[PDB]
Design a protein around this ligand. Structure first.
Ligand code: FMN
Ligand code: FMN
Ligand code: FMN
Ligand code: FMN
Ligand code: FMN
Ligand code: FMN
Ligand code: FMN
Ligand code: FMN
Ligand code: FMN
Ligand code: FMN
Ligand code: FMN
Ligand code: FMN
Ligand code: CL
Ligand code: CL
Ligand code: CL
Ligand code: CL
Lengths: 68, 68, 68, 68, 68, 68, 68, 68, 68, 68, 68, 68
């Protein structure tokens, strides 16, 4: 058949960098979403506290296949 | 913990301007959503009728914290 | 009243071109969403197999009116 | 029939803010254009004099239906 | 000589897809503008009614040579 | 002479809307910068608390003439 | 292994519309290239002659897998 | 009063470079438009013939004050 | 009160990757700036020497609260 | 002399994150290209399998000096 | 060591074209700044008086190395 | 027939300005590519040495007709 996908936007966070934030966001998404297929980073930001990075914040679009 | 956020897109409307459209959209969003944290305006448009602005239409991304 | 809209993102697919992909995606969306009002194409991509287009993939934002 | 629209670009101005600049620009546009249907804000700028905003300047695309 | 061009923006519409909307818009443009040379699609949108595409709406920039 | 300008980026805030945030940011800028000439809005965001807008946050580029 | 891809840019053309231009460009690309995997449309333009579309011109990025 | 501006798009051309193309386009514009105030370059392109630049082509937005 | 922020642009560098470049840039910024609040990555580039990455170069906007 | 550069686009991949994908892509590029000088990340995407990141995919522009 | 750069934004002006505006802006910047390394043009605009270009205005980002 | 074009990216350089950089890049391209048809400037940058512009660097897309 011709599949249809849905694309949602999430932000993963971690003090431990860009990869960790990506992985953390996607891990949360996978808990309650099915048929995840791809992601696309929209932005990399972070929150600073006392001059240090408290959290990296990576905004992602996440695409998944819609069930019939 | 490391929080994960979800970002949805809504359009608020009002005949009474940009601020009123923002506030209206966000008020509707708050009724059913929880843990709203930020918004970002994507566009400001409007519908014209008889040469006057019938509604300002303000598209926003709205970020909220996901529950575990 | 002043209506509020929600805008989601979907990808329609078809081997039979851009229009067919748009129509297919929107047809799937219409099965489970109500009060669809507009769409906006975000991108036109496709997957190639053996040098031929296997599927056109058209990403759309789709706006609909929120119920009270 | 299948309508065709024309989209022009104007800048509305006012010392009294974004909404006033939008409304002012559109009011001028309505005097000499017919069948105005929508607008889209392109930018919000302003001119400063003696440290104060002398005019808000709101650039808009304005769409209208072409007559046959 | 060194030619100068003017670029206007129009929206073509059709229920019958992207190509039909492009062709329709350009056909209307050709009736009252001369020396049309090129177009560039700016966006592909559409209006939905009862879950179906009522009109594809294709916004184009259209360039033409200015007469002396 | 041929003037040179410098362009800085600031964020004005206010609970009372976009215009108030713009005006507040620019008022602060005017206290310590001279020869302010123009501004350009880069983004309109805000912070939400208990479902309400606590502050509108308007990011602006601000241009001023450099002294010799 | 971890694959590496190369992305080139081509323009397909046809008087017969967007899909035909895409297909034509990709067919030419396939003649000399191997392991084509995806495309992404960058722009849709066209050349006008005597008020009619002489060619649709569809610029695409085309990704393919690099051989070792 | 609060002035309203109109912004049109033109392309100036010259074999003799970017400045010459800008100046040429604007000179043509000035012949039939009044109260020209500013321009903004949108793109710099050119046509190549026998490996040489036949014309630089500079697309500009041109803003002018609307008369009452 | 209603706070005002200033946003500057810096480039952090490191041979040891994106996170290291971010952290390095921000560490330098913190030495001579106060009340750092957030950053936003603008670009990730790098310099190549003998086919290897000599430095990752991460351009960031950095926002901080202005003192009264 | 005045050097001329060529800029190509590649996608590096790795299951082990953004830096690893960058390094992998560039290592492949260096095998068959000479005088590599810089890169610029265009996008960070990835493929998901069973809810996990199978590969990070980092699209880069890569600039190199052309030989005479 | 790993250098950190700062990037500021300036506008150079000249009646004598794009190159002259660039050179003028950068010459002013060099008078008070140290370790200038690169620039990137952001926009080319100009002010028109009596139908002629009074000043070309070239906005640049200018990067320089921060001292320890 | 329906022609297909290929679009490559090059950077021309010169100490003598934007036009000279464009012309230099294109002259180098013409030595080893055939059927050059158009260019589009992507960016204007430069390298600064001792406070002066050592080279203007103009990145261009260059389109050419593919042979059968
Ligand atoms: C324009 C703007 C953008 C911001 N972006 C972020 C962000 O990306 N991540 C984040 O954690 N906080 C962000 N913030 C919140 C700030 O980091 C900070 O927590 C807030 O402004 C309060 O700071 P203050 O106590 O110095 O006033 C942003 C604030 C503003 C005004
Ligand atoms: C390209 C395009 C963009 C539009 N954008 C908006 C919009 O932002 N807000 C809105 O209310 N209507 C929008 N519309 C709908 C028009 O405002 C209008 O209601 C519709 O085209 C019917 O107008 P007509 O009766 O003159 O044909 C848009 C229509 C087109 C074709
Ligand atoms: C940067 C990038 C973008 C891609 N975009 C698409 C796409 O738009 N549509 C699609 O079906 N596949 C897309 N893919 C997946 C590829 O088409 C392909 O299926 C995958 O990379 C495996 O190809 P390979 O077996 O040659 O390694 C993309 C892959 C990469 C790396
Ligand atoms: C890059 C640039 C952008 C400008 N944008 C605006 C604008 O948006 N609105 C406006 O009224 N003036 C704008 N101006 C004009 C300035 O506000 C100002 O009136 C002009 O540069 C003269 O200022 P000076 O006397 O300090 O040299 C702009 C000028 C430059 C150089
Ligand atoms: C942000 C926005 C964008 C819109 N874009 C379009 C469009 O591209 N084409 C169109 O025909 N109508 C457009 N519309 C109008 C809607 O399709 C719809 O006709 C209008 O909002 C009334 O819908 P409702 O009766 O559900 O409130 C737009 C409306 C909004 C708010
Ligand atoms: C991607 C992102 C963007 C943000 N943008 C803003 C902003 O524009 N303004 C602001 O005040 N805070 C911004 N924040 C901070 C949030 O509003 C919020 O204060 C912070 O994430 C803590 O929320 P939590 O306690 O629900 O985890 C941003 C945060 C993230 C992750
Ligand atoms: C800014 C600009 C953009 C153009 N884009 C296209 C294009 O996308 N496709 C095309 O075939 N020709 C394009 N052209 C070429 C024109 O369509 C036309 O063939 C050329 O300008 C000569 O027209 P003239 O004889 O009216 O001067 C472009 C020309 C200019 C100046
Ligand atoms: C995607 C595209 C963009 C073009 N842009 C321009 C342009 O900016 N200026 C111009 O004079 N011609 C432009 N053209 C027209 C070409 O320069 C050329 O005149 C036309 O494609 C015929 O070339 P051919 O005889 O090699 O097929 C463009 C053509 C295409 C397909
Ligand atoms: C368009 C362009 C972009 C460049 N971007 C970067 C960069 O992001 N980081 C960097 O270290 N050098 C950058 N450079 C400098 C080059 O990496 C290189 O050091 C310089 O061009 C000299 O190289 P060559 O000796 O091969 O001529 C750039 C150069 C050009 C022309
Ligand atoms: C719009 C779109 C974008 C995609 N982007 C990527 C990508 O960046 N990387 C990738 O490996 N695959 C990409 N793909 C391919 C998907 O990840 C997936 O492999 C393909 O759609 C088949 O999934 P399905 O079996 O659930 O239908 C993309 C597909 C679509 C439709
Ligand atoms: C949207 C907008 C953009 C402008 N951009 C520029 C600019 O780039 N450079 C400049 O010198 N002036 C700029 N101006 C100022 C105008 O050129 C002009 O000096 C001002 O609007 C007063 O013109 P008027 O007397 O016709 O009302 C801009 C004005 C507006 C409204
Ligand atoms: C973010 C970034 C962008 C750069 N862009 C350019 C460029 O466009 N052209 C160029 O010649 N060099 C470019 N460079 C290289 C610098 O001009 C400079 O040669 C290099 O960073 C070494 O400078 P330093 O000795 O002060 O550390 C860039 C460097 C960075 C970090
Ligand atoms: Cl959503
Ligand atoms: Cl127009
Ligand atoms: Cl290439
Ligand atoms: Cl600054």
């Amino acid at each position: 058949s011709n599949h249809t996908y849905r694309v949602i936007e999430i932000v993963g966070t971690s003090p431990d960098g860009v990869d960790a934030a990506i992985q953390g966001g996607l891990a949360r998404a996978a808990q309650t979403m099915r048929a995840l297929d791809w992601f696309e980073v929209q932005s990399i930001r972070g929150h600073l506290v006392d001059g240090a990075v408290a959290h990296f914040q990576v905004t992602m679009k996440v695409g998944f296949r819609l069930e019939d």
